[PDB]
């Protein structure tokens, strides 16, 4: 295991065809997970599984600019289960981040932050046991 929160450097930011893989286990009584792809203090892509928002499980995605959250993009398709080993894969494409969980496509999120080569950190936080975080080019 690795201790959460964890910062994964993304040197020289991201680029199309870069695949970022996060492996871990969801804690048994999990409430929340967050991935924060950051450009300095801005959050280009915040991917936020919520296990109990008004008794529903939802994925919330957004962008934070100058410390202000933007318009939320939401998904009720919710592939995580408490207590289980997961894999989140974020593939950077030219116009969006594409997310698959456990080898099943989940969602796309259009790039709001345009300076891909400045999105130089992935913060990983919340109710997980983190096994590894890495990247490759496809
Ligand atoms: C409660 O904070 C979350 C944010 N958040 C969540 C976390 C976090 C912290 C720690 C761990 Cl361990 C962890 F998993 C985490 F998710 N930190 N900040 C974030 O999820 C944003 C995503 O939009 O929503 C909330 C904040 C929020 C949303 N809105 C509006 C935006 C326009 O639409 C209507 C909304 F009201 N204004 N503020």
Swiss-Prot record:
Tissue expression: A major expression is found in the colonic epithelium. It is also abundant in the activated macrophages. Expressed in fetal membranes.
Amino acids binding a beta-D-galactoside: 69-75
Keywords: Acetylation, Cytoplasm, Differentiation, Disulfide bond, IgE-binding protein, Immunity, Innate immunity, Lectin, mRNA processing, mRNA splicing, Nucleus, Phosphoprotein, Repeat, Secreted, Spliceosome
A GO MF label: protein phosphatase binding
Major localization listed first in the record, in broad terms: cytoplasm
Subcellular location: Cytoplasm; Nucleus; Secreted
PTM sites of type Phosphoserine: 76
Domain Galectin, residue spans: 6-136
Motif Nuclear export signal positions after renumbering to this chain: 114-129
GO CC list: cell surface; collagen-containing extracellular matrix; cytoplasm; cytosol; extracellular exosome; extracellular region; extracellular space; ficolin-1-rich granule membrane
Signal peptide residue numbers: none
Gene Ontology terms describing biological process: eosinophil chemotaxis; epithelial cell differentiation; innate immune response; macrophage chemotaxis; monocyte chemotaxis; mononuclear cell migration; mRNA processing; negative regulation of endocytosis
Quaternary structure (record): Probably forms homo- or heterodimers. Interacts with DMBT1. Interacts with CD6 and ALCAM. Forms a complex with the ITGA3, ITGB1 and CSPG4. Interacts with LGALS3BP, LYPD3, ZFTRAF1 and UACA. Interacts with TRIM16; this interaction mediates autophagy of damage endomembranes. Interacts with cargo receptor TMED10; the interaction mediates the translocation from the cytoplasm into the ERGIC (endoplasmic reticulum-Golgi intermediate compartment) and thereby secretion.
Described purpose of this protein according to its UniProt entry: Galactose-specific lectin which binds IgE. May mediate with the alpha-3, beta-1 integrin the stimulation by CSPG4 of endothelial cells migration. Together with DMBT1, required for terminal differentiation of columnar epithelial cells during early embryogenesis. In the nucleus: acts as a pre-mRNA splicing factor. Involved in acute inflammatory responses including neutrophil activation and adhesion, chemoattraction of monocytes macrophages, opsonization of apoptotic neutrophils, and activation of mast cells.
UniProt protein name: Galectin-3
Residues of the full protein shown: 113 to 250 of 250
